[PDB]
Amino acid sequence: CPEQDKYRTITGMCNNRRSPTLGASNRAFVRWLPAEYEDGFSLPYGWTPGVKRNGFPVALARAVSNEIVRFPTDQLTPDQERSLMFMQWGQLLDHDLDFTPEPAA
Amino acid sequence: CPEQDKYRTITGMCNNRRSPTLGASNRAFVRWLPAEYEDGFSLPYGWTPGVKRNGFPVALARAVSNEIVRFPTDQLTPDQERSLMFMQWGQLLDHDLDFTPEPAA
Amino acid sequence: VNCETSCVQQPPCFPLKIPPNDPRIKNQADCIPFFRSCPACPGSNITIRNQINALTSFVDASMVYGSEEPLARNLRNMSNQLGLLAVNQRFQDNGRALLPFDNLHDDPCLLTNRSARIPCFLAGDTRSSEMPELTSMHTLLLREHNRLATELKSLNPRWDGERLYQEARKIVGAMVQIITYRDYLPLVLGPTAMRKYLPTYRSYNDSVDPRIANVFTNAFRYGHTLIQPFMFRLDNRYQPMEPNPRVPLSRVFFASWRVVLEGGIDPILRGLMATPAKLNRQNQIAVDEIRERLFEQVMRIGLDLPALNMQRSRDHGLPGYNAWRRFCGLPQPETVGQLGTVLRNLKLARKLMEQYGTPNNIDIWMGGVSEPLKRKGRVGPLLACIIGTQFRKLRDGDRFWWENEGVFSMQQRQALAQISLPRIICDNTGITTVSKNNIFMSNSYPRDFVNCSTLPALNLASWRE
Amino acid sequence: VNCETSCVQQPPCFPLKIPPNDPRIKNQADCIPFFRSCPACPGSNITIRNQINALTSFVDASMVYGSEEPLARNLRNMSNQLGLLAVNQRFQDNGRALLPFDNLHDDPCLLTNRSARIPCFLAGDTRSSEMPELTSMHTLLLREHNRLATELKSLNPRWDGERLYQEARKIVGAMVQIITYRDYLPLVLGPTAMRKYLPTYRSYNDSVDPRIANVFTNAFRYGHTLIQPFMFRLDNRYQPMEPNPRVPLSRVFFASWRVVLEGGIDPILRGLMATPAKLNRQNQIAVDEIRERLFEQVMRIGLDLPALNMQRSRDHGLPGYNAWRRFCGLPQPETVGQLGTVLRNLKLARKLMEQYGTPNNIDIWMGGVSEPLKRKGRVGPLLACIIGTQFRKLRDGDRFWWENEGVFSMQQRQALAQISLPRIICDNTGITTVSKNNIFMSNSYPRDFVNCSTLPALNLASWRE
Amino acid sequence: KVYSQNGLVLHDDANFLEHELSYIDVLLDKNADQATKDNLRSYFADKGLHSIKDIINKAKQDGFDVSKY
Amino acid sequence: KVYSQNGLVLHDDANFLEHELSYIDVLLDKNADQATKDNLRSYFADKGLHSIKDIINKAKQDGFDVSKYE
Numbered sequence A, B: 001c002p003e004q005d006k007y008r009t010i011t012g013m014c015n016n017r018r019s020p021t022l023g024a025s026n027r028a029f030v031r032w033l034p035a036e037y038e039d040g041f042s043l044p045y046g047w048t049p050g051v052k053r054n055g056f057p058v059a060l061a062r063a064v065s066n067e068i069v070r071f072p073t074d075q076l077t078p079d080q081e082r083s084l085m086f087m088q089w090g091q092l093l094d095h096d097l098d099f100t101p102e103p104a105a
Numbered sequence C, D: 001v002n003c004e005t006s007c008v009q010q011p012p013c014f015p016l017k018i019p020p021n022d023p024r025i026k027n028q029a030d031c032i033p034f035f036r037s038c039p040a041c042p043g044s045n046i047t048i049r050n051q052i053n054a055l056t057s058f059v060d061a062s063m064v065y066g067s068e069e070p071l072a073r074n075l076r077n078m079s080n081q082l083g084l085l086a087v088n089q090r091f092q093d094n095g096r097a098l099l100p101f102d103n104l105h106d107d108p109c110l111l112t113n114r115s116a117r118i119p120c121f122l123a124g125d126t127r128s129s130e131m132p133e134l135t136s137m138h139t140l141l142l143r144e145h146n147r148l149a150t151e152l153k154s155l156n157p158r159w160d161g162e163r164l165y166q167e168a169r170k171i172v173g174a175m176v177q178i179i180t181y182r183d184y185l186p187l188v189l190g191p192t193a194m195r196k197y198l199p200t201y202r203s204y205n206d207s208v209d210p211r212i213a214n215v216f217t218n219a220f221r222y223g224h225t226l227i228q229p230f231m232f233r234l235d236n237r238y239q240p241m242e243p244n245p246r247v248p249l250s251r252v253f254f255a256s257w258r259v260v261l262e263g264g265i266d267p268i269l270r271g272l273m274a275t276p277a278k279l280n281r282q283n284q285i286a287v288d289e290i291r292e293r294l295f296e297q298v299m300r301i302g303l304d305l306p307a308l309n310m311q312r313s314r315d316h317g318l319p320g321y322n323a324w325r326r327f328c329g330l331p332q333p334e335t336v337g338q339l340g341t342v343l344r345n346l347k348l349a350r351k352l353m354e355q356y357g358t359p360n361n362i363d364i365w366m367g368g369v370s371e372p373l374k375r376k377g378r379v380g381p382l383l384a385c386i387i388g389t390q391f392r393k394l395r396d397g398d399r400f401w402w403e404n405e406g407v408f409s410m411q412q413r414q415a416l417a418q419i420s421l422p423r424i425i426c427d428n429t430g431i432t433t434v435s436k437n438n439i440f441m442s443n444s445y446p447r448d449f450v451n452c453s454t455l456p457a458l459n460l461a462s463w464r465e
Numbered sequence E: 001k002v003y004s005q006n007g008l009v010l011h012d013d014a015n016f017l018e019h020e021l022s023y024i025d026v027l028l029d030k031n032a033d034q035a036t037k038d039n040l041r042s043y044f045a046d047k048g049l050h051s052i053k054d055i056i057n058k059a060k061q062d063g064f065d066v067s068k069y
Numbered sequence F: 001k002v003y004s005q006n007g008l009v010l011h012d013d014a015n016f017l018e019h020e021l022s023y024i025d026v027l028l029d030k031n032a033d034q035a036t037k038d039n040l041r042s043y044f045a046d047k048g049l050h051s052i053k054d055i056i057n058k059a060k061q062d063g064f065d066v067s068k069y070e
């Protein structure tokens, strides 16, 4: 890292001079807790038919959506005390913070 | 992981049922702090001639040993209150806890 | 196996299966597409799989400027020394700039209005076209950069393009920091949590790890509960605009044509200021425009954003609700009764236990958004902990944080504290009437609105050299 | 590049360079050999390089039983159903068992006494021959296993081999836990730190991460400061044994022949009980038997174990002294003055600043072992923090901890609390006179010694079935 | 690189961009100052395009109309 | 696995072990019980040695004297 600088790098390298990948792009997330995978190290829960998590079946994510998350849209409750700009700033901000890549086809 | 077991596995797998590689053999160490490498991610300090750490030259480890660690052996101080078995249990115990592999010749 | 068209489970595809009596997808041999996130160390049977952040974790306005040096250059106007970001060369919005067009071989924006032939936009982040409301925010900040660079060139004529760009970027970055931390986050967390997780800034701390934690990528999706089923557009009287004032969201995803041909960013921004967000309620979590019709115009089947959220958390190996509660120092319910107490809602507890069997297995997003909201906040205690802790790290671990000694002069800090999103809107659009502070709470026209004249512009005099 | 016979810095070699005015190595184009630890994710330019633990982190006596299923089987006596570990087939120690021989194509034990043709031993850990005092400890535990299995077969005749092995193993594992946590660690950390880092055991906590931290591999090398320059051997009067009573350490590395031909493990154990350890002092850190002549009999050049320590911490990307101080909640000196205060030794501080330039750069081992010792402990506050924290995790995060509900019966726990290292020695060797509790503090014959008869044996009656 | 989300390619840096065509116009403008063009040549040479024939040819391969060149 | 430390090979599982020779004697002991031998055959077959000729021959390659089976 240069000893002295005046502006941020684009990548975020050198923000932290002691560990200069910290907060830079194209690096692993940090883990605040140990990961929890079906096989210990890479397979997600739900992968293998009939394999439980902590003694219970894994719920289909779409089932959870259907049963818990679905509601009739005409019953929507406006937030008296928040604008839609509050939604939109959140998404714009998220897009300053994290993008998790996936393989293309 | 089996739902029920009576003894430890040899590898240590399944000791922690939620994250069953934890404590098991042939896994990465956990990091209590972010690593500090010359290039941010893999080259040790001292690797590249002329590259400092936090603004200071990297000291030859052998120099540090020579200047700080060396003492005349006739001046060795026996510990009145510790046996050599205290040394040896530490090495035996260390060998229950960690072996960091290296490439062979 | 192409994960987009195939329902076979083979790496890297983890398609969401369809339940027996699904309200929308009758055919149980079908699936919702899903590609597992790229692993840090592909093919390892030593490492515990982890995922990658392609962006700078810092609040540095990398959505505007990019997080990689080829994109970052490609976004710049390289035909002169004015330090400007590149703008569209075919289209303008009543005389103001639009984002440049990106060039994708398979462009999803073109699939929305086929006949309009308007491609996706190019910005510092690649998701800029996902909804036109987002596009408008990106466009706003594009313009603010170029306005600043223009004002700075006027003030410091001997500054070259590199210098103008950096200084403008440095200002835009602080504006994002200030709006985020002063105006947005207090309304996310509520005052109790704000004082707990984001106490008064002291100074840069080089030992604070500023990385994004894996769990934050899922937790911060709490915002999905805020989404309304329509895009609202308003004319200069803040009345509905008659080329479709209320477009269903499933017809605006990647609909870049709407910005270029249906009246630019002004109506969209009016819509955002003068329409309420949706309230998260335990029985009204997220709407069917994202739960049933996500991206349905550009893709073989509509996705389910809530469900994707949950599949993704398992893809990323995230622990369940009780593990994150414990991490945060919060009680961990074991029974349906105790979960009812925590949620102040026994009915919802019962529904969660019927799905998951134990609160230990509840997926972090689902447990997070199920929690009753903190007073004057829009998340429960668990999400407030995770999101609070994240933004503390991003602030105290950022050497270029705007209040860090050496980053700006005292005079420049004094002047930066005058900025607000309303003013930025006045400066860069045809809108002359905008929300009162706080823009994120103000939501009703005209009760909550003021004329642009009443707002102080950013004074750049202490940038003179 | 063969890192043993070349001084070129090319992966995976990171040879230690030689300073100008070196007391031993005249030629600066020579080097001390060093192989970088295996990376977890080889070849990655995304991951931050990290290293691998080949062993179970748990205090499970994996040095006896192995940490991998091929070795673990190979260590067992497979010719009967008695659940025994395999023993040497060529040699015995006045009738008692010795470790089996390992078969290496380039065996370093053979290179010590060339003519004796005695190879290295095989045990659960691969380093069992490194010094014969270590070998004796491995041998002792081998015998304890087989004695237990024998007693259990007598007690429960219908038990098969698998059952005997597991039960004995489970006992030997608890014995290592008890000796370590009751007898050893309090004398490492001192009472204040023991109460701080290892408060009284409550119960298994499945959220405590039991992994070895990278830094602990370096910090726990504090033990290098305890090493005496000789191996001491004593006859059954606890007098020096006359086939060389005081062998220099540089002639005992890999010297397995000394165990087999120079009188077995009895003299070596007597030596360990009745000889004082070396004291760590700031001007007497570590001896030249390991600083100048490490492994010199089996290798082209003698290594420098302290220097290896420091090269290894950089190989592992470990932060420097002040970062670990801060991690532990200890003041971080910036100036030579402040470091003098922390070390109670301005002279040493000046020497550290001359090497490193700032206390931020001091390698963790060197800073660690430089610190004044806690009252009644043999580490300073930094090392006590790291080592304490590590063993807390190994205890509270171990589902099979010996005191964890359901691992042993109350009767079995009561009986296990009577065990001690002196007793194990009485049970498995020809020694009839052994140290008083605490074996690790007792060090002077005969003041500190008792007869084996006075010590209560382990009663296995509550294992009857 | 190719940035991808839900099977949708959202950006690829490999591709020529439409706004870079306006840079081609500055290079062919005879009355545009020589420093401006040098800076652009350097921009396009950092991307591995060294002549205007190589620049125009890359725009064409990436789907643009370059018939007024 | 080959386990390596400071350029010294400390163990290699590929190699036959001296104590496994005593297992060869149990297999050739005509008066040793058939359950014991089956267990040993399985032990050596888990390692990929299926006959006693293949076992003795592996011990030889790994430096042991096997002339006392002639």
Ligand SMILES: *[C@@H]1O[C@H](CO[C@@H]2O[C@@H](C)[C@@H](O)[C@@H](O)[C@@H]2O)[C@@H](O[C@@H]2O[C@H](CO)[C@@H](O[C@@H]3O[C@H](CO[C@H]4O[C@H](CO)[C@@H](O)[C@H](O)[C@@H]4O)[C@@H](O)[C@H](O[C@H]4O[C@H](CO)[C@@H](O)[C@H](O)[C@@H]4O)[C@@H]3O)[C@H](O)[C@H]2NC(C)=O)[C@H](O)[C@H]1NC(C)=O
Binding pocket: A032, A033, C196, C323, C326, C327, C328, C329, C330, C385, C389, D205, D206, D207, D208, D392, D393, D396
């Ligand atoms: C079972 O063990 C769990 C692990 O406990 C640790 O290990 C054992 C061996 C002991 O040493 C133990 O004392 C250790 O803590 C244990 O759970 C742990 O619980 C603590 C306390 O609740 C949690 O700490 C809290 O963390 C949150 C989140 O921030 C943390 O993480 C980030 C990044 O990793 C860091 O930046 C932070 O510094 C934190 O470490 C904090 O919000 C919280 O502090 C705030 O709230 C408290 C409470 O109101 C205030 O007093 C503070 O001032 C703060 O405002 C704590 O620091 C810890 O995350 C959690 N870990 C795990 C793995 O879950 C569990 O409780 C044990 N159970 C029993 C019954 O013993």
Ligand SMILES: *[C@@H]1O[C@H](CO[C@@H]2O[C@@H](C)[C@@H](O)[C@@H](O)[C@@H]2O)[C@@H](O[C@@H]2O[C@H](CO)[C@@H](O[C@@H]3O[C@H](CO[C@H]4O[C@H](CO)[C@@H](O)[C@H](O)[C@@H]4O)[C@@H](O)[C@H](O[C@H]4O[C@H](CO)[C@@H](O)[C@H](O)[C@@H]4O)[C@@H]3O)[C@H](O)[C@H]2NC(C)=O)[C@H](O)[C@H]1NC(C)=O
Binding pocket: B032, C205, C206, C207, C208, C392, C393, C396, D196, D323, D326, D327, D328, D329, D330, D385, D389
């Ligand atoms: C600069 O920031 C540093 C990091 O700050 C964290 O993030 C910022 C944003 C804040 O939220 C801050 O509160 C966070 O901590 C900061 O350094 C930190 O300082 C704390 C307190 O001194 C350190 O915590 C201590 O940790 C040790 C070691 O154990 C920790 O790690 C292990 C393994 O990961 C865990 O298992 C443990 O649960 C711990 O998290 C503990 O031994 C110690 O606790 C013991 O002593 C205290 C006090 O006597 C008791 O209350 C406890 O019960 C224990 O007996 C602390 O928990 C922390 O490790 C350290 N972090 C780093 C990265 O160094 C620094 O101080 C800031 N500097 C300034 C000037 O602001």
Ligand code: HEM
Binding pocket: A087, A088, A089, A090, A091, A094, A098, A099, A100, A101, C130, C131, C216, C217, C218, C220, C221, C222, C223, C224, C226, C227, C305, C308, C309, C312, E006
């Ligand atoms: C109009 C608004 C929004 C969307 C449309 C939208 C969509 C997505 C999608 C498709 C994903 C990927 C899901 C997957 O796992 O396959 C996604 C992820 C993330 N979101 Fe969404 N989102 C809209 C809006 C918001 C708002 C208001 C958010 C927060 C306040 C918000 C957050 C996030 C985050 C952080 C992610 C993860 C990002 C990553 O790649 O790391 N979104 N969203």
Ligand code: HEM
Binding pocket: B087, B088, B089, B090, B091, B094, B098, B099, B100, B101, D130, D131, D216, D217, D218, D220, D221, D222, D223, D224, D226, D227, D305, D308, D309, D312, F006
């Ligand atoms: C006879 C006594 C001791 C040795 C001989 C000896 C030697 C080593 C060597 C060669 C290493 C590796 C050095 C390198 O980094 O290349 C080593 C590492 C470790 N030690 Fe040493 N040691 C002797 C004695 C002790 C005692 C008393 C210790 C503790 C009380 C102790 C600890 C350790 C540890 C934990 C390591 C790291 C091991 C790993 O691979 O993870 N040693 N020692």
Ligand SMILES: *[C@@H]1O[C@H](CO)[C@@H](O[C@@H]2O[C@H](CO)[C@@H](O)[C@H](O)[C@H]2NC(C)=O)[C@H](O)[C@H]1NC(C)=O
Binding pocket: C113, C115, C116, C243, C257, C261
């Ligand atoms: C698809 O896009 C076209 C524009 O290409 C839209 O057509 C315009 O509609 C407006 C408002 O109705 C008219 O005033 C314009 O004159 C139309 N232009 C053309 C060229 O037809 C069309 O309405 C869009 N379709 C959808 C689905 O809304």
Ligand SMILES: *[C@@H]1O[C@H](CO)[C@@H](O)[C@H](O)[C@H]1NC(C)=O
Binding pocket: C077, C078, C079, C080, C084, C085, C086, C087, C088, C089, E019, E020, E022
């Ligand atoms: C660059 O700026 C000039 C002057 O404002 C403008 O005419 C031109 O269109 C811009 N170029 C691009 C590609 O943005």
Ligand SMILES: *[C@@H]1O[C@H](CO)[C@@H](O)[C@H](O)[C@H]1NC(C)=O
Binding pocket: D077, D079, D080, D084, D085, D086, D087, D088, D089, F019, F020, F022
């Ligand atoms: C196995 O045990 C028997 C009886 O205790 C003994 O005679 C034999 O030599 C042992 N073999 C090995 C390899 O330990």
Ligand SMILES: *[C@@H]1O[C@H](CO)[C@@H](O)[C@H](O)[C@H]1NC(C)=O
Binding pocket: D113, D115, D116, D261
């Ligand atoms: C080497 O071993 C032999 C026994 O084989 C012993 O008599 C001799 O004294 C030893 N030599 C050394 C160097 O100690």
Ligand SMILES: [Br-]
Binding pocket: A008, A009, A010, A011, C069
């Ligand atoms: Br840069």
Ligand SMILES: [Br-]
Binding pocket: A030, A031, A032, A033, C213, C214, C215, C216
């Ligand atoms: Br995480």
Ligand SMILES: [Br-]
Binding pocket: A031, A033, A034, A035, C048
């Ligand atoms: Br992990």
Ligand SMILES: [Br-]
Binding pocket: A031, A033, A034, A035, B030
């Ligand atoms: Br982890």
Ligand SMILES: [Br-]
Binding pocket: A070, A071, A072
């Ligand atoms: Br419904």
Ligand SMILES: [Br-]
Binding pocket: A040, B011, B013, B014, B020, B021, B024
């Ligand atoms: Br495992």
Ligand SMILES: [Br-]
Binding pocket: B030, B031, B032, B033, D213, D214, D215, D216
């Ligand atoms: Br570490």
Ligand SMILES: [Br-]
Binding pocket: B031, B033, B034, B035, D048
């Ligand atoms: Br790291």
